[PDB]
Amino acid sequence: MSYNYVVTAQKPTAVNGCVTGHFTSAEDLNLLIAKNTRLEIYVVTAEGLRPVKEVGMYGKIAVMELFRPKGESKDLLFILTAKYNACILEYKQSGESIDIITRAHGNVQDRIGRPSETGIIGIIDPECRMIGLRLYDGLFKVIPLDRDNKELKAFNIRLEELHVIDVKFLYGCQAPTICFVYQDPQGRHVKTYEVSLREKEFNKGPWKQENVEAEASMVIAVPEPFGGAIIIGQESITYHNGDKYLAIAPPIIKQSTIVCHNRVDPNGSRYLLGDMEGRLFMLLLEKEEQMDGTVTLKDLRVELLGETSIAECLTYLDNGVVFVGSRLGDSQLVKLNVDSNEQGSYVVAMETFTNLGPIVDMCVVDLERQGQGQLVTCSGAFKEGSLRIIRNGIGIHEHASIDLPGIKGLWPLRSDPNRETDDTLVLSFVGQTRVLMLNGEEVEETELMGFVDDQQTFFCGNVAHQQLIQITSASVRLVSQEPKALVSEWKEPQAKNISVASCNSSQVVVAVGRALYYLQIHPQELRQISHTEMEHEVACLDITPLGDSNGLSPLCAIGLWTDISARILKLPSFELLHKEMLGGEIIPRSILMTTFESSHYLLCALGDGALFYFGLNIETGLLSDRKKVTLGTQPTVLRTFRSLSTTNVFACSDRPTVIYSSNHKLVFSNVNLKEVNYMCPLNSDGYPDSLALANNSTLTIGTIDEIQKLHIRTVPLYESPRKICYQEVSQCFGVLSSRIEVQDTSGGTTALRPSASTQALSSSVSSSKLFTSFGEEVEVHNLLIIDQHTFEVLHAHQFLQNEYALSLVSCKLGKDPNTYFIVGTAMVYPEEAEPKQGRIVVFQYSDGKLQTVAEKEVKGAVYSMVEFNGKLLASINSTVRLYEWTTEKELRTECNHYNNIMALYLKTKGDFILVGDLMRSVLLLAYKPMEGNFEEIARDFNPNWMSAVEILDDDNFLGAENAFNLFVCQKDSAATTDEERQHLQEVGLFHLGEFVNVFCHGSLVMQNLGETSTPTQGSVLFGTVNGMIGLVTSLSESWYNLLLDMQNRLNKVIKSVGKIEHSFWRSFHTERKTEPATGFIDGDLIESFLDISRPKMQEVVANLQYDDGSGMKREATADDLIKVVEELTRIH
């Protein structure tokens, strides 16, 4: 009884693994990046990374490795999913079609077994003889690697050592030999085994157990010719080969522990290391020893290269380039230039890839356009803390507004020879063509000499030979720049009226009724060069010069009124070089030819609002590539505005859009405007690189932003931001933050780097009196005020010592007109486990200064706060308390309600406090105002880890819980039994695959009522640790049933990578119990329906029983689904 619809508004960005190898081809060098469920395949070139393929797998990539067995030309990819769905993939492309085929696949989980504490380890034999997986304690799983093992069957080999830290395969061994470090009561040890496939058991290792450091963490296998393994702890790096042994204690690595590594030389002479706080090291192996051809180590020098982002996965690309794959920061692409050394750093950054995770807090704010929200996150951690502002859509910054009664055409002109800039814009109404002049802020209607006065101009622009043209409804009149005299005027021989006009730099082709005349603009002349007629009236014409030449279009495209067909014909003739019969009924309204990214297209817009993009051949002929995109429900006018050193096409309609090319495909962003009827690029002197947009009410001039669907501005703080709230009246942001300060031997706390708290305009330190070892790191909490326009730190309030600030709310209380920042803290001491004292402090930002209006001292930790109807509701430990803002600016207790749970989460909707804890103990309350106390309505207790919770509506509540799941609970208020009334039934399950930290009501698209509204009700955004912003909406029962049927039918048509069943992937998963998903419709699977081929589209729908408004219409068509699916795509 929930019927909800979940979709991804921004794909995950945090990198949890990256490999290199010859995957796509034996010649190319590929960098494969797994970000979560998405696998990105790049190609390493001199300029950088060139994306090639984007595949999204049905699972979280836990292990991926590239291996090449015998008899293969390029490396294969082995991927293991967190649900233990193993597979082996192979790249296969034929010209334009790219397919990642599944060589093998099979689930490798066990019926019984506790997953290991150190997690999944997946290793592949260097000779590609088997695959070793350590999924479960006390069991080594081995997958034999033979061509006949297409189901990936594996056998378990018993390990007597239950605590295994790191295991890898050794290089240069006749039989597959593993090496690992394990934990014992006597300490940590290194051991090796000789795995035998025939006997299906272990054997005696080449070199026996050796005692290692008490904190030995990783094993790295040195390749031939050195051999053996290198074991890196917190204080030492040791090399083991049996008889040969080395040990070093470099002091440059004692500060932090190494977590990641990657070989940089095929011969393993040098290694690359990274630690927790983000500095690159450089382990070096010296092969100077050579007695009788044998190569042995002699030293283990460690060199510090520099500081990079906090890395999770290092990888060395070709020619001194390192890809630092960060997960709590931003990915980098750095240079290992050993000669630069500007100040003592060996690394310089080249690129920086956006990474929004971890998203700890979000808020939706109408920053620029009223009605359209913007997401301001609290991303990153440690030195990578930053605020991200995500905006959906290209936006136009208005700079002028001249009211006009429905301009029917805007066209720029230059009435100033040798000016190199626009001078005036020639508008054209229904009956007259006014010529407005605009140099600076001028709006004068300065009529040109050669332009007609009372006519609806069809074209007006700068023509060749320093002349201006004006293709009016009467005749094509040519004018002059300097003398401004009518050089020529080609009237219709039969005194007919021109229907459609199209002009180029040197040519002008006009259509009078069903006849087409081609006229060349010779210097001070206009002589017809051709004349022909078509079957029906010309709906539209387009003669745009393609690449090069730019003086004579080889082809001209037209549209037929009574045929609904588009043809391309040679300009100096009438020979139909190609034809097409796209659709029917509604006639074409505009034709345009573009050159997006050196590839030529041909865009035709029908009168119903659908643009049918197609490919065109410049030399001769054309392709078909029929891809109809429904960009609005009004006739579309297509114009080309460069504005980027690129082509770009602005499709004016009820939903204005910019059609650009991202890499080699045409993307379709949407412009944040209500409706633009006509547009024209005005590069006027006073308006640099502006664009005149004419709605049905007025003409506006402004500048477009950057052609990109989602834009993420970054404001680095260099400290971890915890919570964020927005205060409208002050135009400021209230953000909590923490910085790490080391305890020096002077009684103070010195910092580690310049942060946003130590670099504010004005500063403060909390001064309240209501109540170690050299090297210890202590957290210092601040409340920063950040401007919403400049995003500069206006103030930085520092809290007391040992005080942890937990929550934050910006609301006005009681009858007071002032709005405040309410901050709830907790005084935490290392000696004690659970705090005894906290503090509710009310700030007030005015005149650029932060003042503490009021201060309340409570007994506990204030885990959350909400503004329940002019009354702060606080959750002090396990007590939910409601406060009243007195007339003297002092908080007063009104009612208490004691729980047996820690009220970590408080979400209110009217008078219904939703209370939860970290044990998934969702509790529902109601606040009776006539009596003034809280009352418990429902309860749903189930032992499980719950990450967040949100009130979808008065009945359904949504939350995220363990193993990356989602759920919905619903209270049946109509139950006649009290036991069911007091119970919260669970009506939805879903394995999202992501860890949600925050829910927030809002939407990133324009809020239009639309009279008929939309099939989706409500909108809730969530942000995850990996950096994925989703969106969950409700559905009606009929729509839920239709989408469920379509989702079942898509699963038999769409072939996934690895052949993981969608029902299995979305099944609610947990270490103790997994059930199928219910009540959730996957927006990704549904939205993938638009990308399948037409025969597959026909296969998907054959009995859907589409119509619900009377009848069934059992045929159900296939474009009817397109109408439904696009409506769902528009909600995000």
């Binding site: 949890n16 693994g17 836990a62 997953p115 504490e117 150190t118 997690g119 605590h163 830290i165 790191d166 934990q183 009561p185 300490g187 940590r188 008490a214 904190e215 963490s217 990783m218 522990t257 977590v259 990641c260 927790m276 999770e312 996965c313 997960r327 709590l328 995770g357 971890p358 700890v360 807090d361 951690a381 440690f382 971890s720 915890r722 919570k723 942890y804 937990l806 935490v828 290392p830 000696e831 486990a833 659970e834 820690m902 970590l904 970290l918 044990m919 032992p943 499980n944 880890w945 990450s947 967040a948 363990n962 193993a963 990356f964 860890f995 930290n997 925050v998 640790v1025 270490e1071 103790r1072």
Partner: protein
């Protein structure tokens, strides 16, 4: 407050040499399938909440119970003990199944008395309390499952820092500056990925298994000088059950701890109870302090509390104290059936209401805790 010399050889208390010596023993364990309904016979005349892992002594006299237990030993060996609520007369909805490990039948007194000892194994909730005309009603039993949760960091863990999640063992044992400093780096290194989530590390330490177990061990040693690993299990399930058994709480709190399905919630509840508890006063008076919480030691490996049977079959749970107050004794110190091998129990009563709170266990030898051992029971001891 007798320190140092605690000479008892404190395991004898948990062997019950009073309920007979050469008692026949039973091999090992059994198992009931999770979430299954079972037919488990109910032995009557027992009114006590049997925590799993807790030993339950029993003497059986009436022929119906003797026959039931005989057929029980010859078919399985498990019966049901129901957690009776405040209302008596079969007002129970939860319970635990007892499973036999020692058995002895005596033909003495012209009767077929059967002396038996059992320990709780599983936890269940009764569907319907079917009654049989024989006298031994069989209950409709649903096996309530036991929940174990992974680390709260396992979902939000970073893969890299996972090898750094297998800690070296605790330094030495039970030493200051080896706990307050070890635990700090333990919390800092275990919950380093709490920065990705929205909550600080100490919050995730409040829901930890090992940290809660450490804090509870601290308080229990603060009372009775425990022997580090004096049979305190490493498993949070078993540790929680042991602590719940040994806590000096009333019946409602025991039932509430029995209702809880997860180890972490049980440990948090025990911490709350043991932190908010101070005095133990006489039920029939709710007016007299017959203890405190500091004056409480353990001569049994099972804690300050264990189940013992008087020769009439009634089961008593006794609380061990150094020095009880407001108790008057009657009768010479006698030693016929003492559950503690070497003392001579003297019956104690409230100084006002005169109710059987417990006994004073005076010594016999001289290398003993000299006449300082009050084994107060729970029939009159309301935590106040």
């Amino acid at each position: 407050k007798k320190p140092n010399i605690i000479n008892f050889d404190t395991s004898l208390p948990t062997s019950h040499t009073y309920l007979g010596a050469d008692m026949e023993e039973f091999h090992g364990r059994t198992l009931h399938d999770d979430d299954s309904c079972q037919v488990i016979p109910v032995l009557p005349q027992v009114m006590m909440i049997l925590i799993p892992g807790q030993t339950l002594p029993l003497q059986l006299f009436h022929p119906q119970e003797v026959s039931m237990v005989r057929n029980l030993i010859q078919k399985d060996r498990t019966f049901a003990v129901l957690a009776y609520s405040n209302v008596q007369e079969r007002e129970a909805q939860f319970g635990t199944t007892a499973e036999i490990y020692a058995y002895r039948e005596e033909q003495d007194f012209g009767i077929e008395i059967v002396k038996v000892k059992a320990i709780g194994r599983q936890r269940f909730k009764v569907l319907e309390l079917r009654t049989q005309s024989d006298g031994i009603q069989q209950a409709k039993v649903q096996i309530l499952p036991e929940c174990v949760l992974p680390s709260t960091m396992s979902a939000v863990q970073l893969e890299s820092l996972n090898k750094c999640q297998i800690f070296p063992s605790k330094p030495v044992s039970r030493e200051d500056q080896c706990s307050y400093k070890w635990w700090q780096k333990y919390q800092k290194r275990k919950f380093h990925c709490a920065n990705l989530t929205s909550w600080p590390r100490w919050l995730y330490s409040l829901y930890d298994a090992e940290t809660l177990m450490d804090r509870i061990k601290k308080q229990l040693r603060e009372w009775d000088e425990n022997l580090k690993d004096d049979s305190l299990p490493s498993n949070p399930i078993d540790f929680s059950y042991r602590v719940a058994a040994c806590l000096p709480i009333d019946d409602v709190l025991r039932i509430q701890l029995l209702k809880i399905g997860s180890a972490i919630q049980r440990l948090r509840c025990e911490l709350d109870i043991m932190n908010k508890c101070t005095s133990l006063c006489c039920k029939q008076c709710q007016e007299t302090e017959i203890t405190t919480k500091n004056e409480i030691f353990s001569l049994s490996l099972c804690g300050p509390m264990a189940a013992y049977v008087n020769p009439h079959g009634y089961v008593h749970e006794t609380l061990t104290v150094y020095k009880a107050c407001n108790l008057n004794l009657i009768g010479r110190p006698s030693t016929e059936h003492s559950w503690f091998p070497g003392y001579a129990w003297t019956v104690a009563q409230c100084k006002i209401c005169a109710s059987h709170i417990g006994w004073k266990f005076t010594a016999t030898k001289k290398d003993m805790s000299p006449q300082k051992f009050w084994g107060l029971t729970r029939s009159a001891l309301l935590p106040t």
